[PDB]
Write a protein that binds this DNA or RNA. Sequence first.
RNA 1: CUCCUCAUGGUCAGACUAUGUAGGGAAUUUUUGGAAU
Lengths: 49, 99, 73, 135, 39, 49, 36, 1063
Amino acid sequence: PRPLFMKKKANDDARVLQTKKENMIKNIDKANQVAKNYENEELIKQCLL
Amino acid sequence: MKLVNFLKKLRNEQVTIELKNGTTVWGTLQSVSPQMNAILTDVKLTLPNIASLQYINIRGNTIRQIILPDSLNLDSLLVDQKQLNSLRRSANKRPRRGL
Amino acid sequence: PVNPKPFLKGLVNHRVGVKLKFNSTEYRGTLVSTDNYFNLQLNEAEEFVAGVSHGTLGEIFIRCNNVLYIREL
Amino acid sequence: HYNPKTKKLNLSAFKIVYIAPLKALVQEQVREFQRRLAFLGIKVAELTGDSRLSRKQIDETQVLVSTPEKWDITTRNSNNLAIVELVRLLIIDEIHLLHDDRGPVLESIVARTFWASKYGQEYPRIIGLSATLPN
Amino acid sequence: ELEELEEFEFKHGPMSLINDAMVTRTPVIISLRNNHKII
Amino acid sequence: IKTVVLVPQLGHVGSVQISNIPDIGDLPDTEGLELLGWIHTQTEELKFM
Amino acid sequence: FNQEGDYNFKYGIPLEFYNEMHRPVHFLQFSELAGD
Amino acid sequence: YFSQLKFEGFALNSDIVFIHQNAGRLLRAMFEICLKRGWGHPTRMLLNLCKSATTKMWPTNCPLRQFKTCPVEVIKRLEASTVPWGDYLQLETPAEVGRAIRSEKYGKQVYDLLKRFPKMSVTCNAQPITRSVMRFNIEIIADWIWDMNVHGSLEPFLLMLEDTDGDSILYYDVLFITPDIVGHEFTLSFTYELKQHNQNNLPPNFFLTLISENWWHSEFEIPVSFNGFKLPKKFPPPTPLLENISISTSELGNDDFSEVFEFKTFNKIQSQVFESLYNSNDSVFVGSGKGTGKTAMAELALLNHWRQNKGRAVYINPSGEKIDFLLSDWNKRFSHLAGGKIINKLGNDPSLNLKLLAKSHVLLATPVQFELLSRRWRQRKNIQSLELMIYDDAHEISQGVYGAVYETLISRMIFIATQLEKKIRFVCLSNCLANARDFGEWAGMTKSNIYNFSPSERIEPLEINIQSFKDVEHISFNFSMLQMAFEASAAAAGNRNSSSVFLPSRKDCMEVASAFMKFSKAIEWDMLNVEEEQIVPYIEKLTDGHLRAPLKHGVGILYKGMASNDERIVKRLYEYGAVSVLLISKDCSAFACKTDEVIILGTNLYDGAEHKYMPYTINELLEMVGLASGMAGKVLILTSHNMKAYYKKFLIEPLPTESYLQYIIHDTLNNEIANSIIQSKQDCVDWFTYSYFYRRIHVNPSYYGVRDTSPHGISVFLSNLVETCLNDLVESSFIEIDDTTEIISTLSNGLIASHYGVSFFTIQSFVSSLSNTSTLKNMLYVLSTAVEFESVPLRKGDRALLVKLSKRLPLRFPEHTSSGSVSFKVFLLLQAYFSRLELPVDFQNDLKDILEKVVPLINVVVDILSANGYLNATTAMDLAQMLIQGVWDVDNPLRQIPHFNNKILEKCKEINVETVYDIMALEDEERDEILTLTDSQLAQVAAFVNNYPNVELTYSLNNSDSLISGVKQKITIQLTRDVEPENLQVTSEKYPFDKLESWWLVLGEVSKKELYAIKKVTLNKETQQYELEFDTPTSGKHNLTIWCVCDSYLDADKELSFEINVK
RNA sequence: CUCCUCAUGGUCAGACUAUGUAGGGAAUUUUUGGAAU
């Protein structure tokens, strides 16, 4: 009750992930440094703007 | 292998160290350096009339011999470094076993 | 050059005697082997103290550091 | 378990338990036992609570000073039963604790000592120590 | 390779006496520098 | 609907900020999974978006 | 958060909107309440 | 407290001290409770909380805090950096880590500590066993580097199997990752029964999540993929048992066959099959049950075969120890009644088992042996003519790779039947199987011929009592198990019943024996039911150095490797009732001691190779429950909770049978190509049409990973598999494929590999390691690294003792491979074979197994070097000699002669003998002086001397004057033997298995280390000639040295050197 | 535990400092004794 079969029928990315990951970490690192730097203001902010 | 490691195992052990100068030492090993420099506490020391000393550090080369307790398990303490070296050193058909 | 190591290698499998620095002990026996650091192994060893036979020791190991000299007998 | 002639102490034979209700009093007791038992070369260490003894040190030790709760929980566990059998000497300090609601733990421990070990069946020495009490 | 050579040299050298001692569990006598002997 | 895909977002009351369409080709059990749509929560009963 | 930016994805169980992973700022503020 | 807040007002601080001491307790309790309940949302969060009580921190505080050496500034920076933890873990370059953590200092330290943080590449392949039961094969890799200070003793990791939501827990287990497991590819298997609705409609995936009980934020969750997993049909019930007893020994035709069975009336199950069995000649699936005699039914089949004047019979059981017992019972009775028939058991040699295949009417062999012998059916025409086969215990085709070997044999025979148009009667004897009818169908059978019964059909009602205990998964047994076993034994002993307990090892048997004695001494019953003075006369021998004291108190010891006499005494005590209790190790399930009751203590046995305990096969348990029958059959099984549902189902209900060919396909297809039946890939697919595998992949495609279920889908998936196979073979140089359907040819590697039957992977390993200028140590290592040694067991003691043994051994294992791997053990046991150490009886068995494997392997080692044309094959030959004999080449030739020891060797030095050939010239009086010993040993020595020939090496060259470079130059070497052999048997004490002698003729030049020619010869005659067709070397003068080297006997090396000038 | 070597990440113009599945701490200036009497 079983049919016969035919053999003819069958017949860098990781580095990029690690890289984009490194750029994500570094960018978040620069951003975090910016947050640390951010961590009177009305008149000074008016003078800047 | 290195017996000094076997000495390193000997912390908190009460021992009597005979020394090359003939001095007898009795105390609990706090540590032994790899130099076999032995630091001990609660030490009675007899120079060739005992002096009682809180802590004594002995330079390894001066140690003649160290007499260990008879209760110590030498079979267990001797085999370490070989196992550590083995640990440092360390397909279809996988299951010989079935269901 | 004839080095102490080759002379000693040729001395293996021969009856030898070794005078230690103390001179308190000399050992006469067949020279079985010697290692690179020059420790000595003798067989059928005999001990001569003060030039007289103390006794027959047998298979014996001599710490290198004690050896004053070795001579062939 | 220790010969008068041969001065080697037999470590693996006897085991000792001292039931002191409080951690602090356990501590005090332990220093006392160390002071008095130092000449035989005995390890007197605490089994209870902040003591934090593991599976091994119990085997290594000879004299134990425990609080009732932690001793109950140690002897309740099925794997250690060898240690429980090894203990010859069960000391109960302040048996008058039975009045208070921790005392239930002591009587449970007592019941376990008599009734629970019948397969080895050698009953340890039990010493109660208490303030003077009626009945 | 170096480890192998060291173990082998140890085996066929004068060290063979103390190696043979450990394997056979045989007694040996050691003349020491203290003028004491250990059997 | 076999696969819900939860994505980077910052929500507000009645509004939300959402990242791009996800690139999920790498994972298994994705053999041509088409993009059906998206789902969201609200508290107001509307017949329109 | 970046409105257009790349992210890796995986199968798993999603967390609560207010869950410990989503509220890290609160722990530094919580211990910072007593300070040091 | 989680956040580390010490306080000024100390009332709060006192309360928080209380919470400090009891918090991890309470939380841990809640976690365990939820885990018992099987609730997904709470259990993970509770596990995190427990971790937080233990290590005092939050998830949002980085796990670097719990390192003792990690500094404060760094952890502050990471807390404030708002970065996913996975990214930091994925970072590799240390400088790049320092840049990522934005402090250049300490970066290297941080990366070191990361590689000290747990990191797992985890995979899981689920697969259904049947529709209800679902087995998960998990591959758990551990990439982190160990530290005893930081990590501690071991790493407990909780493995959760939870549903697609994460709502409820399906299955859970705690697993210990030891220092040995880290970095190895570690498989973990478990089963789960499904629900009714989840059975009907099934989810896209289940979540498999690993969490550290200690380490923070491990969180490795890999989806367990269900995509088009289609479950099979409802299990069909077995053929019914009608009520008839009336079939008996009177029905059979000739009355000489009625004196056989030592009973008259047959059993209830045998009476059902008897009509199709004894009368007709058709293909019969006899089927089920261990207790109901399958031996008896096989006997009937054999008689039916003889009755028709047929005469060739193949009885195949996988258990080699019960084969021997069955041979002992058959030869004394069956053989003499027909009156001529030769019953034999096959040995390790292909040549010897061939000569037995000729001489003997009936052959008994393991599937591996007879598959290896029958691999060339075209070339051996005796195997084309085999009329009748009994496949005994066909349920063991499920068992590992060996079951796949055994279906390769079955498929090969069926392919032979179809190809040769031969009528071959297959009698398939097996256990209760749910998928049995499909299995018979593929064998050329009919639904009427198939008889499958349920396990409950047996005639001795047997209560299977399974009892589950806690924290047992990581241990062989615990103390509660031991008590309960003792209680059961006491019930049996107080009753008239006799009882037995089974154990993982000899060590475990000893431990349980001492324990039992301690239990007995207190209670009334230590009783042996016999006086204490009777028992010492039986145990006078005292072999098995501890078997005395346990057996003296009424508990016997039984394990493989024992002194046989001593074992037999134990068994006799049991049968006579002297010992009411018997402790049998696992491997001795083949020794069937009928019991009134059976206890099974521990379901977990340790193997080193796996590096964790693994539960027993349900097959082993079956062979372990066949022993006991009553007044009422009683079986106690001491099991875990995780294994309870697996044993409680598959013991009572039939075993679903599957096919493991998909693992061995490389080797199998290699074999087919070597036999050149499969000329092309089309030919191979048509060959895979005969597999029990094929039928199976159709009925249950989800188990084999073929997602498409359909004729086209099957075809595509199968062709994919075979294509992958062919690429491995051409890359490994087993074959070659070229377009003109398509043409495939065989190379020298595939030839030998397929002929000896060594697996593809082993051959590939040999190829990778073996080169020119290789040493004997390297060759021996290469030999030790193989897949054939997977079946050599280790529990922890074998490995530690290997370390202790290594002081005393001639060689030293290569430093860059793993000590725990079975290869190192094989290495040291070969060392202990070369030097005759006094081995523990545990290691003797492992040595025996190794020896059963090695001879083909060492043949492959010498021949592969010949194929690569290196003259160092001499050393391989010497090593092979050493394996056949048991002595080194340089150590002493004298020790080769059987049963020599130091003292006796000295007498040989006394008479100044060097070679063995001088012993042949000796006379009787001198021999008597040398050996004073027993008569059997003297006889074996005499046989050794006789069959060890003094053979002379002579050559005759065609033309010495005309010598042309690069031409095929035929030489005729005349070889002549001292005595013409009666038979070729090789005699060795330390190599128990039988060997036929052979020889290698060798030609090569010493300085270049080039072997020009080699040939193998079996010298039956006294004098022969052999023609080496060998290409000549380059121009000029060429040294050519011919060796005649025996495969068996050392110091037989006969050499003749001659030089020719080639133009 | 300590010093060296090596590797390494960083900083400075070879040196310094943290970490390390690393090697080591018996042949003249130190730790495998010329000490012993």
